[model samples]
Target: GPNICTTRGVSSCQQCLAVSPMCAWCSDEALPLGSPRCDLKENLLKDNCAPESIEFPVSEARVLEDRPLSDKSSQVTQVSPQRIALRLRPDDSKNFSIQVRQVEDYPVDIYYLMDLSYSMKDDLWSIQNLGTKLATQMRKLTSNLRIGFGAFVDKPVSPYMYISPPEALENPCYDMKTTCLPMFGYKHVLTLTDQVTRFNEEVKKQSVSRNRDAPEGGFDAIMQATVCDEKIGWRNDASHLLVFTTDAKTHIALDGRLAGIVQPNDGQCHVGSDNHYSASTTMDYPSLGLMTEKLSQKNINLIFAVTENVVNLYQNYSELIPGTTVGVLSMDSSNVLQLIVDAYGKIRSKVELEVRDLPEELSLSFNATCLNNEVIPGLKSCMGLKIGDTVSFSIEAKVRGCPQEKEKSFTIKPVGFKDSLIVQVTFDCDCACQAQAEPNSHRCNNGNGTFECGVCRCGPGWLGSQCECSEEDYRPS
Candidate 1:
């Protein structure tokens, strides 16, 4: 009788098609296929596949670069949840002595979600050329960092369909003309990988597809990019940055109507008929609402890169997506790398978080200061913070309307703590933006001076104890 060896013997055609139904040979010569082979013929080994050593999905920690939550509001009376206790005093005085120390070690996680759309042909090329360089630059931010990658295109169904049938589904791009391939809800692509070579190779192989109508499946990609942490390969030990790159705006509910795929996009991920890979039938494309909800729950920070043509559209989406910021880049491929570098600087520097302590009934206000500017004061107040218990709020600063010199200072004073904790903020200033000069003031400059307690006094018309103000002459009536 033949030993019945398939490729490595575990369960190739011969074993499953074994002569005697219930019997299968275990060949010593056959190399292991890594997992237990299920014998469906006799049904003798019902759960044989269970015992095999399949690699457990990687575990990931999500560190959200803390940003002020007040950006979500339209009002000015924002109090930070962490600084409610410090009675956060905004000081313009030049003679107040203040000593603030930065821990210098901040963790970061990068989730690269690139658009596989034809428009990104140039962008993808640059990414391939600069993968190692990008990784090296990223290392400068955090020695402890994890990198993950994923890709997406428009929904693969009709309307957005460019090539018909076998041709379109397989290769959406036609010669120099390109259209997004079929829409994929999202593919994790690769789990977080430390191997820069692997990251580069995977990115290099990414194909460019067609650009669908008003809607591209960008939201679907983001949903999976954030939820499928096991697939995209997120790292638990570092801060998480979900970088979403695309040349077109996303398709929301009813937005896909332009292509006549009028049915609402279902949010489930595992329902497609043909295995799990086909995003068209298995998963429903996500709506903006669906994406926002999922992202908030997962604590993912979204950085959107769109071409100049759709920068405004991207800005609108970024505004609606709380922990997201939008960056504009050239459609030309050569500039893609530069755009990413610039986006990284804008994102790394302006991001901030207010760590709040919520008790059984937290009651507190939070405040953050930047130079003489009280960037966001009283941003949040919650009555649920308990002693020693901590909560966090995040902010994603838009490069628009922000100053050229990025310097943000923050102070968190618990309601009960004797003193306040100061946060020294810095951004990646090597991009187009410039870093702010060091604060100059007698109080901030020197080690010590002035009155007791948290308050300071300046002499004469100088106001405050720091003598930072100019005295006005009094006219005798």
Candidate 2:
């Protein structure tokens, strides 16, 4: 049987050679003997087979590739890892740096997604005059800005909204003697536009909707706004910002089961012709994992605007999802504009690096240094950085075991940045090509000494090749 090794569906001598140093490759070009094969130690060393030797001078860890998004015409600057790659061997550690700076005049798109439940009526009213004032403040940061609006209540079904009172089915607020709009899953009231007056007009037209539970179907609305690309009119070139305003905790996945809506959200656009969710009554609430994936895929930054009581809730959500921030909302949203402005500043200054689809045997670690030379270990993010300031990340990667494949690839990038670093790694565990060089049997001096691989073993005190000379005949010339 032919002795060979298969790696990644390719059979070769080097693969078998790597299995054992005693292995050898028989390259009988003239004889055309079946195929090149690896053989046992004695046969390989004695026959034409070339003994395999271990590769030397292992490769060290270093950046192999990177592409950054910073340029002369760019508003945001990334100094390092425009695109970065790294390579490492087993037990090897490498350190690298990542620097990002926020430049003035970065274009921003802010979409307002507010909870319109009955309890948030006061908060909704306070935001009616938010458009023009907020636009004016945002202009101080960037001249190019756009705003949009959307609203959500709860699922229009039993358990989530009143359905038994007959009149309550028409309007959840009918029992309280307060006229209200019909509850909906979500509504994209306005597309992104620079017209502040239109933004204000749209916000004023929204009326409160009542729901049965304190937890509103805000996740459903968020998921729709994220996936409905054309319907929401999200701009690919501008920085996406979603301001989610709510006064109460929001319902998540599985909450719709109580209403007999057993179908899980499919993470797609289901906006009806009348601009309402068509599957509101039948679909389950979107899970946080689905929402997070959609947000990242669309590059949308989320700002959770909620009351102090639920700040921790949104904050936890923010931790679970990247590119998200939580802001404390006043009873009437009195500080919303300032919150947006402050949140934008924080999101811009903070930098979080992430790695994806790493090899099973490889482990990566990071040490970050931010402003004022503050250093933190085993962390991938740095905060409180100011514009024009630089932050450095010292990354260390090590391979614990050899991979079956010769090469592997991974990616590194800042959480919200558009550009990324691509890394291509190649392993150095195979034998060197010099191992197949011509065998030096003559060095053993014609039957006087034995030749093993490329070395000679002389008999007894006889020195030199052939053992033809005694110790007295040896000269130190």
Candidate 3:
């Protein structure tokens, strides 16, 4: 009973109509001069304001796009509710059923990023010869498979490399058996391609370089390859795989201080015409967290292929990074092709749903019924799903706060899948207007003013609280 509707401060119909659904304004002039003008609809009508002089609106929600489910060959319908228009109040919520079916024969993209330091030369050679064989093996899994290649060494600055003599700058591998290419941070050597010959030609052209430190720049190459979506030719309708291959540990965040490079990694594409990461010494290596967030945003799955000796280090990465799986690579990387094939299969059978672009006022919780149909609550992911398996998520979207302005739409999508469920939401948080409200109705003092929400809205000519008197006869109460 102690509501803002009965407050003495609510003296006008405009202010009264918006407090809450229960609140309404009374414009009856017969009431005593100082009596309160606004209260709950039931309280005001029973107390003094008649039924005809109260203004309140009914909250409403309407379904905008409600088409029946069907999977026509010409058209695909994966989600039950492709769209909706919701207008809800603070104390209310809407439960909607979302159906997602995994379609057969989805295209897949795998970008191989390898550490090109001198130590990995053997691994590099093994990779160089697997282009045609890898593509041939992948074609058995999917009709469409495109692969790309990128390489990284450590930072080329003074401490990260021997940046003094002309020979050190020209060839960091001079101390080894022979001369090699100069050390560089990262290079996007090849765009995504379906042709097997193009991949082998591009990869074989790359020569191994050496860095001063044992740690490499794998994160730097991964960051550039992901964000440079247009340059790398990332496909929207395909699942992207960034297979990171390395035999050594990587330089994490703040490790660049050994070379005095303190500027944080901007997580932007800085690939120059030479196809190399131009901002090596200018920016620090990105942290593990940054790498995870960027990969999530792009829906790119990561597969870390480290040597048998350093499995624990990369194994830790698989825990922290979402949609990532790590496995041990042989010292010669002869099993690189098998590793990619096995890892892709491991990733395909599972589906994890993630909400994107959600507003602060809205929160979504999911219930997925998968496999045995146990109806797992708060389970947005399902494992061992077949290609034609249909999984449905019954979701509850609750509104916590009503802001004046917010992003109206949000998307719920499975990780690394092309299909997405887009929800366009609206909150009935505003008391500005309502369905029960009648404008210019004859109920307002017998046409003296507009009957808005059962109250007399006198423009300027009519006066008094209920338009009971003309302007000349009106006085401030």
Candidate 4:
């Protein structure tokens, strides 16, 4: 094997330190300042230099806030060491420990947003028993459970909506045998309520709506329904679950150009007093990037409860959207109650842990050790966790170089939970002895070399300290 610290041109401490992490420089006035002084720590520590003469610095870590992993409802904490401080060397990594304890009876909020296109006319009827059934089923895992509902058809414009016949605009199904609700991009059908009857009644009252296009305007609906926190009554302290149901693929960004709408979708609440998304007619559909920003910022969990016909489409969507899950439903959505329960259960059993607010040069990975002393690399996630079950992870973080500033802070937390570990890192980019170095000092080669850490870095051709002889005529002083 090749070795970095050897009898090379490593006459200076500065040059040796760059070769390897343990490459250190030592000083002994009795001995010459060359290979014995510039070799790696293994050589100096075991055979070569005195203990007090070695100039080596190592990385360090200290906890600033070591809060206990709590399961108590009053001060529930899943991620421990709420604050941390790190000292690092370039390309030198430090490992830290993080633990997560599943809290018992964590509060939960589930909002069921549905596609109300005429094609989904019968799907609404199948959820008649959903609100109460889902609430009862989820109570085993949570003491606080609430449910809400919203609906979507498609963008209101030609090719998506009919505007020619006087009656077509009002009831897109008028030409057919029956009447229907006007097409809408999104509707705030119900606010988040603990009362299951409110959810049940809203589901009952929702009439089938019509849209001209096969693909739906779910992008507009998802954007508004998520950002309109006040109108939809999304809770801050609960597991913010958005259960989106649709049987058709959704129109994404640029699809609005088909109707001459080119403006990009703004990821803001644009719902009006009428409980409708007002900007749907003006803005294009939201892109994946826009949806992820709003969804992750709000700490919202998305469950794409799509019909079997479009499971593959929503599957692709779930991958793009972090904190999202895709579940296939039987046609007409009769399996919604079970699907919702399973999705929520999945959330509870699995802990998807991750880090955020990291600099581009800094990279972090996890060597997660779970039950039975099982270790997995890059295992930022753990599974099979139930109430009061604890999981711990080992995080190894490194940086390309010293940051612009000495101190940089980043966050680590579970995907949907609000609590986070704020890690404040202080980089030790240079050795403490660096401040004492005197460049062009007369000690070595009569000012031909530098003096640092009580040692002489001999100049080129000056092979040894005292440096009185050239390289070809050198011997230890």
User: Which candidate number maximizes TM-score?
Assistant: 3
| lDDT by residue for model 1 (1-477), tens | 123222233322233222222333222122233322323322223433223331111112122232233321333212222221111111101111121222223456677777666556666664444444556677765465667777766666666665565666666565545454444545556567676678777777766666546456766666666666545555553456666766555666665555555554454444233323354433455677877776676656666766777788878877776767766544333344454455445332222333433222222333444333334656533332221222343322222221233444545543322235444333321211112222233552152334321122344444433344445743347
Q: Select the stronger candidate by lDDT from 1 and 4.
A: 4
Each prediction's Cα lDDT score?
Answer: 0.47, 0.68, 0.70, 0.73
lDDT of candidate 2 over 99-190, digit per residue (tens): 66554445788778878888888676654544445566776777878888888998888777787678877867767788888888888898
How does residue 319 of candidate 2 score in lDDT?
88
Query: What is the alpha-carbon lDDT of model 1 when measured against the actual structure?
Result: 0.47
List the candidates' TM-scores in order. Answer: 0.44, 0.50, 0.52, 0.51
Error of 1 at 454 (Å): 59
- Model 4 stretches with alpha carbons more than 4 Å out: 1-104, 127-133, 331-477
Show the colliding residue pairs in model 4. none
Candidate 2: segments with Cα more than 4 A from true spot = 1-104, 127-133, 331-339, 342-477
- What shift in Å separates residue 312 of candidate 2 from its native position after superposition? 2.8
The TM-score of predicted model 2 comes to 0.50
Cα lDDT tens digits for candidate 4, 56-105: 77777888888788755477776787888877776677788888777646
Candidate ranking under lDDT, highest first, comes to 4, 3, 2, 1
Q: For model 3, which pairs clash?
A: 53-454, 54-453, 54-454, 55-453, 88-428
| TM-score, structure 1 vs. true | 0.44
Candidate 3 lDDT by residue in tens digits, 1-477: 646765644535545544554665555454544345566666765676564644454445455665555553545565556666666655445677766676556678878887788778767765454444556667787877788988888887977787556677886555664788888888788899787687877777888887778888787888888888777999876778777778777888898888898888876888757787677879888888888888888878777767778889888888877678876566344455555666566555577778888766567677988766889897787777867677777877767556566437777777766666676666554344345556655556676576543346576776454667776775758
Candidate 2: worst-modelled 10 consecutive residues by lDDT: 4-13
Candidate 2 local Cα displacement, residue 237, angstroms: 1.5
